[PDB]
Design a binder for this molecule. Structure first.
Ligand SMILES: Nc1ncnc2c1ncn2[C@@H]1O[C@H](COP(=O)(O)OP(=O)(O)O)[C@@H](O)[C@H]1O
Lengths: 79, 97, 67, 102, 98, 66, 75
DNA sequence: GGAGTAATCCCCTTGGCGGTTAAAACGCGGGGGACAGCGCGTACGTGCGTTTAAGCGGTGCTAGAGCTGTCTACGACCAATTGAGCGGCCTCGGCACCGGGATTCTCCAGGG
């Protein structure tokens, strides 16, 4: 029971560029930023699985996302 | 066929997409990517309800900041749009590893 | 249960009597206020251990350097 | 109240227990355990004024997370404090390059 | 019953009549199309439904006979299920087999 | 820093073709970074119950931000 | 060591820091560490701007090359 | 007379579908974005004739520094009482994006 990605849009990636200050496009705009997404997320989850496998313990409430992403290099507020 | 110069209609696209709280990421498959990431190694998550929104907005922050840094490095070069080399410049200098 | 909201609206009445705000702003207030509390407590922990003098000046230095 | 010693109004009891037992200092010796609540009142008041000004404008009376994101990105002291944070339920700062623009 | 719904399929496979079901045995993009498939006349003869999911919240008009199998908690629901077969497109009486 | 030190920096300097540009640029943030670090040192040494800068009170100067 | 000699940087540091607090003094240490850290930051910026110039199809870095080197290194 | 066996509640999952829109992509026109070689010169290139300073080493103590008696100046237990805002609710002021009304944003083919 697993699902996987299909390509990350022409339109929504285009709006991602639109709020990134982009009007036209090159051939290197849609796909690669998602590759940076995948690399950064794989690094942060690599650190997380190292943390949770060194001691073999689970996680805690939703306060983890702000701390883990702050160490990662881009955290969030909102609640 | 009122077909005008691209870039100015792209400018009105930018104006529409950069005005309100609209979720520019048509991105429940972003959530499925997050699920594939999370269940790639472990299981039995049992997380909160709206945490998907928070993690996705952090994803948006990272990716969009990458977008603006890439566009700055692109106008630094002689190429206005997003180029992979500009993204390499924007990520390597950040200390990617 | 316990709400800072009543005290917050008391301060508002000190500032503005009849203004209404949103709940999302209240949640962001909770998050940022508490993380400021955590950071200010973390900063002024072992300063008294920098030299053999282990108060108010600890938190004063905390706010002096974080701001 | 237990907080009106110096113009403060946030609860004191649980806060007294937590600050006294902060587990970071051996003892707060004369001593401002209530200074955390003091800066807490300060931040609460500034947020009150800013949110009242924002909600009262835009021809509305409510705070949309867009307004709070704008306020968070507005300040410079908060940017120097922790400049590696982002606000959700909104958008990034609008931008278009003159070189991008026709 | 689920163990009847997972057994009627092999009966249909053996007896070889065109069939489709209003049950948990289709795909995501075969819901409205199948609804119109039942709504429009065709060569089908077998439509399998549930007691309270596809038997109460639908407007089936292309049916003539009703087959029950069981009813645990339904003091006045089986009559409604039988009526669900009936519609203005049923010029004949609603036959019942139990 | 003077002309010969910048000259050696440009000798490293990407086949030396970047000389004038780094000559003009690298001196702009020198004083800024120096002021930042000395201000951080002053803030760290403020709470030392002493009268002069000592290495005892500046060990964990940037513990907050590394 | 100190490619920019110890006395010039010492003079600059003392002149800049004299305005903060009167009668400020240093021990035998804290003399050559400031210039070493400054040069470490300068070399990191040099590496970043060299990478940018490698991208920029010109070996010659510029104002904007160093600006990108400094901005995207973390601050 | 409280626990042992076991009959009860039950609700929560293990899983598969109605209903469903967004999610990614096509797709054609073109025109602005894609990325660079040359012009040449300006943008740097550079190595030896010409000096202040830098990093010091020749006395005497010389601003800050670590220094051991015996403490001055304070911050945290328990026990009967009690007030702050909390335990729960929802009151009267003011909401909340496309319409009444359409000038803006952007290009293009003739006036000129
Ligand atoms: N007077 C009528 N004429 C034609 N059709 C009707 C009339 N009254 C009811 N129906 C049909 O009967 C159906 C019954 O609807 P309802 O009982 O609300 O839900 P469900 O169809 O799921 O049982 C409706 O879908 C409607 O089309």
């Amino acid at each position: 029971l697993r699902d996987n990605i299909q390509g990350i849009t022409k339109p929504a990636i285009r709006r991602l560029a639109r709020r990134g200050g982009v009007k036209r496009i090159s051939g290197l705009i849609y796909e690669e930023v998602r590759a940076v997404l995948k690399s950064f997320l794989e690094s942060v989850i690599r650190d997380s699985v190292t943390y949770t496998e060194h001691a073999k313990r689970k996680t805690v409430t939703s306060l983890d996302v702000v701390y883990a992403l702050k160490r990662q290099g881009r955290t969030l507020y909102g609640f | 066929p009122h077909r005008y110069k691209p870039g100015t209609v792209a400018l009105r696209e930018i104006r529409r997409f950069q005005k309100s709280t609209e979720l520019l990421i048509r991105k429940l498959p972003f959530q499925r990517l997050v699920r594939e990431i999370a269940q790639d190694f472990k299981t039995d998550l049992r997380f909160q309800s709206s945490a998907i929104g928070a993690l996705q907005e952090s994803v948006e922050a990272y990716l969009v900041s990458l977008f603006e840094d890439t566009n700055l490095a692109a106008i630094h070069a002689k190429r206005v749009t997003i180029q992979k080399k500009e993204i390499k410049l924007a990520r390597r200098l950040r200390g990617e590893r | 249960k316990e709400t800072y909201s009543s005290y917050i609206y008391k301060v508002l009445k000190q500032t503005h009597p009849d203004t209404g705000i949103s709940q999302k702003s209240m949640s962001i207030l909770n998050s940022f206020v508490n993380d400021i509390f955590e950071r200010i407590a973390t900063e002024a922990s072992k300063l008294a251990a920098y030299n053999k003098k282990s108060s108010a000046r600890e938190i004063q230095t905390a706010v002096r350097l974080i701001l | 109240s237990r907080s009106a010693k110096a113009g403060l109004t946030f609860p004191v009891g649980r806060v007294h227990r937590l600050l006294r037992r902060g587990n970071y200092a051996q003892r707060i010796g004369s001593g401002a355990p209530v200074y955390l609540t003091a800066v807490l009142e300060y931040l609460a008041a500034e947020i009150l004024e800013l949110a009242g000004n924002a909600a009262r404008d835009n021809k509305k009376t409510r705070i949309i997370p867009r307004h709070l994101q704008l306020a968070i990105r507005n300040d410079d002291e908060l940017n120097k404090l922790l400049g590696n944070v982002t606000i959700a339920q909104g958008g990034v700062l609008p931008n278009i390059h003159q070189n991008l623009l026709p | 019953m689920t163990k009847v719904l997972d057994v009627l399929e092999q009966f249909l496979n053996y007896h070889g009549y065109l069939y489709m079901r209003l049950d948990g045995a289709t795909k995501i993009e075969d819901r409205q199309i199948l609804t119109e498939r039942f709504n429009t006349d065709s060569r089908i003869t077998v439509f399998i439904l549930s007691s309270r999911s596809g038997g109460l919240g639908i407007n089936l008009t292309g049916a003539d006979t009703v087959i029950f199998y069981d009813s645990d908690w339904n003091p006045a629901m089986d009559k409604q299920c039988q009526d669900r077969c009936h519609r203005i497109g049923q010029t004949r009486d609603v036959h019942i087999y139990r």
